[PDB]
């Protein structure tokens, strides 16, 4: 066989220990899920420094906590805008997930609160910026470098999927790099807790699984497809399926054909062919052996999964950090005021926040 007695017993024990870890993690999650924390700070506890990120959601600002001096990333949502964009449920869900999960590669919600006009999620400040920027600058990541990040996503999805959370928003734009070079996952608006199938068309064209494009009911295997896209893009510098317009991208995604740079190792191509598998009955992460087909793949043979989880692996890349509050790994945005009305807006909608 492929393993002698010692290696087989070690692997089996390791896989059993994962089960035990996840069983405890689920119990911890469900307690916080069922009784969420609320209203753990207020706006005047913080000085607003600089906008780090923007979007239809609102903005994320670097803030400094006045008492402690600690920096945080404060996501600010306009309650009236959220309502108008039909994002009430997504916004409530994002905060509910964030305050309930606990994993070393998931960003921590340190405080949350609301006022008459806005919702505030105060997260730890992840100073290295988006993987996207580093990827586009460096061009592509070496396979060891890509693997180090991929291993963190594998473990994070193993954790999330055990909680019946589908993530659905994986892409380099949505992965931040912390001061030790490890990943932080931040955005959970598209995540959904469902045991079975779900049907919403959501995500980013290059990262959509075929069963999403084809308007099928789908399950957590769409996250393993997206992992294949991410690994490919990290190692190539461009994604496996691209075109001028999304419709052309979808045609390629559903076609069942993918092509690889000549510098991809055979192990990497084999992994990617099994993650970027249009046939759900054959896709790694969706088989009887579950996540083990991925973790035990040859491309991950050098990965010490426990050492990754414990953050004892030396990262291949440490972003520049000229001290706390440093924002040099983020873009510059036009700074708007934070208006708080004398009149509460959309109160009932956001009771649970």
């Amino acid at each position: 066989g492929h393993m002698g007695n010692a290696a087989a017993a070690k692997k089996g024990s390791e896989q059993e220990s994962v089960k035990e870890f996840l069983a405890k993690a689920k119990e911890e999650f469900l307690k916080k899920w069922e009784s969420p924390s609320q209203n753990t700070a207020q706006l005047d506890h913080f000085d607003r420094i600089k906008t780090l990120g923007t979007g239809s959601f609102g903005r994320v600002m670097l803030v400094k906590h006045k008492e402690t001096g600690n920096h945080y990333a404060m996501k600010i949502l306009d309650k009236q805008k959220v309502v108008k964009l039909k994002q009430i449920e997504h916004t409530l869900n994002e905060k509910r997930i964030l305050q309930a999960v606990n994993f070393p590669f998931l960003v921590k919600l340190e405080f949350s609160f609301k006022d008459n006009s806005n919702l505030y999620m105060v997260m730890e400040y992840v100073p290295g910026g988006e993987m996207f920027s580093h990827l586009r600058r460096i061009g592509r990541f070496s396979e060891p470098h890509a693997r180090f990040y991929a291993a963190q996503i594998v473990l994070t999805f193993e954790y999330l999927h055990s909680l019946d959370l589908i993530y659905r928003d994986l892409k380099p734009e949505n992965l931040l790099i912390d001061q030790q070079g490890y990943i932080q996952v931040t955005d959970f608006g598209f995540a959904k807790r469902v045991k079975g199938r779900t049907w919403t068309l959501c995500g980013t064209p290059e990262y959509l699984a075929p069963e999403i494009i084809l308007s099928k009911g789908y399950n957590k295997a769409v996250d393993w497809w997206a992992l294949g896209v991410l690994i490919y893009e990290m190692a190539a510098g461009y994604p496996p399926f691209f075109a001028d317009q999304p419709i052309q991208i979808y045609e390629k995604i559903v076609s069942g054909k993918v092509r690889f740079p000549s510098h991809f190792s055979s192990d990497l191509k084999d992994l990617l062919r099994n993650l970027l598998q249009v046939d759900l009955t054959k896709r790694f992460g969706n088989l009887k052996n579950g996540v083990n087909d991925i973790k035990n793949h040859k491309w991950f043979a050098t990965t010490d999964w426990i050492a990754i989880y414990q953050r004892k692996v030396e990262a291949p890349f440490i972003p520049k950090f000229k001290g706390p509050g440093d924002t040099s790994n983020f873009d510059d945005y036009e700074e708007e005021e934070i208006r708080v009305s004398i009149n509460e807006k959309c109160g009932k909608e956001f009771t649970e926040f």
């Binding site: 928003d169 734009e173 959501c202 290059e206 510098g237 461009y238 691209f242 999304p246 740079p261």
Partner: peptide, 20 residues
């Protein structure tokens, strides 16, 4: 080349989700 095709796609920048 594939790289050139990627540059030509116009989709080298940050990509929005479908709902945006």
């Amino acid at each position: 080349t594939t790289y050139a095709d990627f540059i030509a796609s116009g989709r080298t920048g940050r990509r929005n989700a479908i709902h945006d």
